[PDB]
Design a protein around this ligand. Structure first.
Ligand code: HG
Ligand code: HG
Ligand code: HG
Lengths: 195, 196, 194
């Protein structure tokens, strides 16, 4: 009565209630707190902290920077591999995630905000299908290189699967004489909604 | 003065007795008196496990397509995951048709999906380039035809955005030779239509 | 003698009205509401491509450029289109201020989803505030013309600092085709939007 509300705040004299007006397609209320409808979350390898990946059961290794960007219900997966050995024929890199929480078991990953800071969010938003019966494989063209010099044009396979209640992303690069040094990216869908 | 206080981001001004929300204008804004984002993310996509059936020109070759169209800022990221059963030979033409005023996919069912998983009641105009119909964005993208998780071909896929008869078209021209049309591809384009 | 509807809350202990928000998605920044992971796009303006020169040659190209910040990731996308038929490798170079991020090569703007220009210093496009280690790489591309296939080939990218300025240097290798291609890559920005 003896105060007013500037938009987006509103007062209703009928029920004596102060409210926040918001556009529902962009923002929403979640357990009584304001949230976004389509927030951006990134589960990534930390700054300057690549993950060490093993080629199958061999004692061949590579350093990987990984970003997993959630927008809407899409996950954009991006990996920047860099091995020191000149590999074999096909090589198999495997990321393993907890099937309930999404936490990377293979190596250290963090939910990072735009502030730079680590967010206290369980990374379930990277999991496809809450039901563990997922299909999705595919190929992507890549370029093996070294010291900023072109080596090969070739391809990289990807596959998403569940085994023993754990989510796997399995990449199959096919080099021949070159080292496994390449960036690749793909998109997939997460049925798990962000609450 | 007042018999109450305001924690940030709420503020009280004792001069005009008014409660406000303080917000950073580059990130948030007010739109018809309601709070909104400056650069919201919207996705117009094929529904979960509900691919769209596309036909290759007038031929009896078909393909199932999952499609995502992600709006950030004024950029649209278009992603398609095709999978055909016939082995095509030569170039094949897949064509998506959208309403030129509303953006609604006429070719098959698509929905605006939020990050919650829920369908949003939003007209998909945010996927339209150039308000009113003189667009000429085309390009090529390299792809990999495959089958049963086994490598077939490295090849290319053309894309073109056009208007015809007040309708927005996205036309993809994959050039396989012996392989089935099975590939993911993605490109970015601009939408002049602001989300205001 | 008033109530608060969620997400507004009243605490009778300290007589204080608050906004409840989920901290992973929203936050307070100098007392104002903001996003945790806002989307910012530093781009060439609508219908305003940037004119790029191939080294010291009198060969030019028009480039549309988007630099999309999500979290701490920058997605870089360029759509080049030249009129000359180059032969051999060609070098396109984008130059940005190393402290502010402002494109020195040509006009770029922070554009919101509304279409409007945002008054934001484009520091969010800068990788590593003190030079460091990463981001040279290659990406496969397709040279074309008039919507007709020319070449499958490759494009190099490199992020470097020289004289306190951030450079993005693309090295397309055509051999008779015009330089007409889209390419995109991702990199990390240590500079937090705070
Ligand atoms: Hg690979
Ligand atoms: Hg195609
Ligand atoms: Hg290039």
């Amino acid at each position: 009565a003896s105060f007013f509300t500037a938009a987006p705040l509103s007062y209703n004299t009928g029920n004596s209630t102060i409210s926040l007006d918001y556009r529902s397609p962009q923002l929403r209320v979640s357990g009584g707190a304001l949230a976004l409808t389509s927030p951006v979350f990134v589960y990534q390898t930390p700054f300057n902290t690549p993950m060490r990946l093993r080629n199958g059961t061999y004692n061949e290794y590579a350093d990987a920077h990984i970003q997993m960007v959630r927008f809407g219900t899409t996950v954009l997966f991006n990996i920047d591999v860099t091995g020191e050995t000149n590999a074999t024929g096909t090589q198999t890199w495997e990321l393993q995630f907890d099937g309930t929480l999404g936490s990377c078991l293979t190596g250290r990953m963090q939910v990072m905000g735009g502030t730079g800071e680590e967010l206290d969010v369980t990374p379930t938003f990277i999991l496809p299908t809450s039901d563990k019966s997922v299909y999705k494989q595919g190929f992507m063209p890549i370029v093996c290189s070294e010291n900023g010099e072109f080596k090969q044009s070739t391809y990289c396979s990807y596959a998403l699967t569940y085994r023993l209640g754990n989510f796997y992303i399995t990449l199959k690069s096919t080099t021949s004489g070159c080292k496994p040094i390449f960036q690749m990216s793909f998109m997939y869908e997460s049925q798990i909604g962000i609450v």
